Design an enzyme around this catalytic site. Structure first.
Site, short mmCIF file in Angstrom:
data_model
loop_
_atom_site.label_atom_id
_atom_site.label_comp_id
_atom_site.label_asym_id
_atom_site.label_seq_id
_atom_site.Cartn_x
_atom_site.Cartn_y
_atom_site.Cartn_z
N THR A 82 0.83 -1.20 0.00
CA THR A 82 0.00 0.00 0.00
C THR A 82 0.87 1.26 0.00
O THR A 82 1.80 1.34 0.79
CB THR A 82 -0.96 0.00 1.21
OG1 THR A 82 -1.69 -1.23 1.32
CG2 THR A 82 -2.02 1.09 1.05
N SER B 247 2.35 -7.73 1.48
CA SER B 247 1.28 -7.08 2.22
C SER B 247 -0.03 -7.08 1.46
O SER B 247 -0.56 -8.16 1.17
CB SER B 247 1.71 -5.64 2.58
OG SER B 247 0.91 -5.18 3.66
N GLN B 248 -0.61 -5.92 1.13
CA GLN B 248 -1.84 -5.92 0.36
C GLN B 248 -1.66 -6.70 -0.94
O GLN B 248 -2.61 -7.33 -1.42
CB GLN B 248 -2.35 -4.51 0.02
CG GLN B 248 -3.65 -4.57 -0.77
CD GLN B 248 -4.23 -3.26 -1.23
OE1 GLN B 248 -5.10 -3.23 -2.11
NE2 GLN B 248 -3.76 -2.16 -0.67
N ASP C 263 4.12 -8.46 14.13
CA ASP C 263 3.52 -7.72 13.01
C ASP C 263 2.11 -7.23 13.35
O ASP C 263 1.29 -8.02 13.80
CB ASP C 263 3.44 -8.60 11.77
CG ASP C 263 3.17 -7.79 10.51
OD1 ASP C 263 2.08 -7.18 10.41
OD2 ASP C 263 4.05 -7.82 9.63
N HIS D 279 6.81 -5.48 9.91
CA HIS D 279 6.12 -5.59 8.63
C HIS D 279 7.03 -5.27 7.46
O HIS D 279 6.82 -5.72 6.33
CB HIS D 279 4.91 -4.64 8.61
CG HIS D 279 3.90 -4.99 7.57
ND1 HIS D 279 3.18 -6.16 7.58
CD2 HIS D 279 3.49 -4.32 6.47
CE1 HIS D 279 2.36 -6.20 6.54
NE2 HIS D 279 2.53 -5.09 5.85
#
Length: 207
Positions: free
Chosen positions: A13, A90-91, A175, A187
């Site tokens: 993101t 991540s995303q 995280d 993260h």
């Protein structure tokens, strides 16, 4: 022509267009396999910030899942004997997770529970690497890391992915997004912490 190996990378993101933090294992594969080629997934990678187009997290994820599906399915139809590797941070991990494993993303409003990759494409996906995936839930066979809980979009208990054996998904305890910790720094370091492990896995699946 078609390459023997092609890789798809999906960024986190607010990262600028390209691979973002998926670059570490994307670049690892490319340099391990000269002649292989890679492409970045085109999707908002956003959480409402204007810098990335102002799309909400929910809308960004929905668009990303479709983007992954379209790009991988089309590539596979063009290059049916090419081995595919997916990498998502991540995303970027979450959108590939849904695309490849199905089950939808109820927290983000994605209601379709079907696997979105075609059967042909799933067959030629040989390895998928997720880092920092908010759908992480401890107890799945494809996960590694010290997280013993799960993320803000965690899969439900008893979830099973048809393509489990092709995946490695990494998440540690501290995280705040793929686990229930409170150290954001965690993260951001999966690349250096698990990149080598990830590459070995991809290697064992590719030959």
């Amino acid at each position: 022509s078609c390459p023997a190996i092609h890789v798809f990378g999906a960024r986190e993101t607010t990262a600028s267009p390209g691979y973002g933090s998926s670059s570490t294992v994307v670049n690892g594969v490319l340099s391990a396999y000269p002649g292989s080629t890679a492409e970045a997934i085109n999707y908002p990678a956003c959480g409402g910030q204007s810098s990335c187009g102002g799309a909400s997290y929910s809308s960004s994820v929905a668009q990303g899942i479709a983007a992954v599906a379209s790009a991988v399915n089309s590539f596979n139809s063009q290059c049916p004997s090419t081995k595919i590797v997916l990498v998502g941070y991540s995303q970027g991990g979450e959108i590939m997770d849904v695309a490849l494993c199905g089950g939808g993303d109820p927290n983000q409003g994605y209601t379709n529970t079907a696997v979105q990759l075609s059967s042909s494409a799933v067959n030629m996906v040989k390895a998928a690497i997720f880092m920092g995936d908010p759908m992480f839930r401890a107890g799945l066979s494809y996960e590694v890391g010290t997280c013993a809980a799960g993320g803000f979009d965690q899969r439900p208990a008893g979830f099973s992915c048809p393509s489990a054996a092709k995946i490695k998904s990494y998440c540690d305890a501290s995280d705040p997004y793929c686990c229930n910790g409170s150290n954001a720094a965690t993260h951001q370091g999966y690349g250096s912490e698990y990149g080598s492990q990830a590459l070995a896995f991809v290697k064992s699946k590719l030959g």
